[PDB]
Design a protein around this ligand. Structure first.
Ligand SMILES: CC[C@H]1OC(=O)/C=C/[C@H](C)[C@@H](O[C@@H]2O[C@H](C)C[C@H](N(C)C)[C@H]2O)[C@@H](C)C[C@@H](C)C(=O)/C=C/C=C/[C@@H]1CO[C@@H]1O[C@H](C)[C@@H](O)[C@@H](O)[C@H]1O
Ligand SMILES: CC[C@H]1OC(=O)/C=C/[C@H](C)[C@@H](O[C@@H]2O[C@H](C)C[C@H](N(C)C)[C@H]2O)[C@@H](C)C[C@@H](C)C(=O)/C=C/C=C/[C@@H]1CO[C@@H]1O[C@H](C)[C@@H](O)[C@@H](O)[C@H]1O
Ligand SMILES: Nc1ncnc2c1ncn2[C@@H]1O[C@H](CSCC[C@H](N)C(=O)O)[C@@H](O)[C@H]1O
Ligand SMILES: Nc1ncnc2c1ncn2[C@@H]1O[C@H](CSCC[C@H](N)C(=O)O)[C@@H](O)[C@H]1O
Ligand SMILES: [Mg+2]
Ligand SMILES: [Mg+2]
Lengths: 250, 250
């Protein structure tokens, strides 16, 4: 109903392409290419064209996290670790824009090359899963230049969008943000989750939100529990849909 | 900037599909399928997937006309005659939604079958052009149910959108609107333009806008001048882009 609500509603439907309803890649448990409403609603398919694969329920979750941070005066930026085509970060920048927020940044972190090749240093669950095998099949490698172009299409490429290109184990320890209000983790593997919890989570403000996109994946979940056990973190884990969870840092 | 401005901006870029940049059908003077930014900007291509073909300059014109009418208190509804997939009507409905206007309607008038088969009742310029020949090539015939579906994808199918299915010569004389603030004519032919000027233009409020999408088409232009000459209409014809013009009713 308000201009703000209308904009953010359309922005979600647009970055997930409920508007034009692109086919999905046939991969994983998806056995047909046709668009299925319930799969895009829950972020369960692999869009051929859409700018995000997280789906409406996880987009609604990101909106709730950012809005709650803003309402409650939780200081800091938004970081997403694993962005693909950039749709969820585009949406994040859009939320700031809708509220005319000029003092927070959206940090966009990725290899911009898809999943890394497995080495002997990987966690054995990451090695067995070998996410790198799927890069082309779902068009995962998405260059920095492409992501930036995608932001421009929505008129949201500006100096409150900053990019952190590279492997998370390399980029996160010295990433130049001071404080985060929302940390959205979407790198799927034990390694990526643990890199980001280790190196970015300490900068998450009290009251801020930690979102684990891929908690359904056993390697991801293992890292979340190892990390929480190590640091004494007991904040409730709340489910979003069939894949994602989040907690709010107390 | 404001929520409203951001919504209407995004809605334009969405119905014209500047977001995902679909190919064009190859037809008329368009010889290549690739998306070309300047052609989508000026509404000169035949989108394979986008909901309107009128392009950003003619979307912007529609916005200007509807907002001036609202601002100046010109009474009445919005009618578009020739709606194809419905994008320009979806956009009009979205303008009213953005300003929380609850007392005006968007009327959506089309054969829902593309251009009419030519008979010996048609104006000789319409018969020579034979627009009907291009129906399949630019995917023109678009059913009422498809247009309703498209509105629903934006959240804009409600009781302030009303449909007028049929040939304009049949639907216009008794169409149930009482007054119009904007009359957008997009039927291309002498016949479709003369049908709508004859039977709907008298209901256009003073201060209201008459938009001729296809003024570059000689048959359309002939109808426009015959009608203005007959009724003594001398209101300045203002050019929008390389196709459309409008005037404001004195
Ligand atoms: C297509 C790429 C995809 O791969 C699949 O979905 C693979 C599904 C396998 C076929 C499953 O195996 C089956 O289930 C049982 C084991 C009995 C089955 N049985 C026949 C033995 C066995 O066949 C998995 C359950 C295996 C486990 C290890 C797992 O969870 C692996 C996850 C893989 C995730 C990537 C999607 O990338 C990310 O997904 C995130 C969730 C998204 O948010 C998003 O970030 C996205 O980019
Ligand atoms: C594909 C559909 C299209 O067809 C064409 O573009 C055909 C172009 C012909 C090929 C041109 O002729 C050629 O020029 C040279 C002299 C070399 C050729 N030579 C063989 C002599 C000669 O043949 C035209 C100039 C002929 C004249 C009669 C004309 O204007 C016809 C109009 C046709 C309009 C429809 C566009 O649909 C509507 O357009 C609106 C503008 C939009 O707003 C929108 O509503 C849309 O739905
Ligand atoms: N260790 C690592 N370092 C940096 N990027 C990683 C990584 N492991 C996976 N990625 C990136 O993680 C992303 C997973 S898919 C992320 C989906 C995205 N959030 C969306 O809205 O659709 C891919 O873009 C991939 O390149
Ligand atoms: N005499 C007539 N009666 C009713 N509909 C007509 C007609 N002549 C043409 N049409 C319709 O006119 C439309 C021309 S294309 C309209 C483009 C649309 N305004 C957009 O935003 O993209 C087609 O949908 C066609 O079916
Ligand atoms: Mg994920
Ligand atoms: Mg036209």
């Amino acid at each position: 109903s308000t201009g703000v609500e209308l904009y953010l509603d359309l922005l979600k439907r647009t970055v997930s392409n409920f508007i034009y309803q692109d086919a999905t890649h046939v991969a994983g448990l998806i056995t047909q290419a046709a668009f299925v409403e319930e799969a895009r609603e829950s972020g369960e398919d692999y869009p051929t064209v859409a700018h995000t694969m997280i789906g409406m329920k996880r987009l609604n979750n990101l909106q709730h996290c950012v809005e709650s941070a803003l309402r409650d005066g939780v200081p800091g930026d938004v970081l997403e670790t694993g962005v693909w085509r950039g749709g969820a970060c585009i949406f994040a920048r859009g939320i700031l824009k809708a509220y005319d927020v000029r003092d927070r940044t959206v940090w966009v972190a990725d290899s911009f090359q898809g999943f890394p090749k497995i080495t002997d240093d990987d966690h054995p669950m990451d090695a067995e899963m070998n996410l790198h095998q799927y890069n082309a099949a779902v068009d995962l490698p998405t260059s920095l230049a492409t992501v930036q172009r995608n932001f421009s299409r929505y008129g949201l490429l500006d100096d409150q969008v900053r990019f952190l290109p590279g492997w998370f184990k390399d980029t996160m320890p010295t990433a130049p943000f001071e404080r985060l209000a929302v940390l959205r983790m979407d790198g799927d593997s034990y390694g990526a989750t643990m890199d980001v919890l280790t190196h970015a989570y300490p900068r998450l403000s009290p009251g801020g939100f930690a979102i684990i996109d891929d908690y359904c994946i056993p390697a991801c979940r293992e890292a979340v529990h190892e990390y929480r056990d190590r640091h004494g973190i007991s904040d409730e884990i709340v489910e979003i849909d069939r894949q994602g969870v989040y907690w709010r840092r107390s």
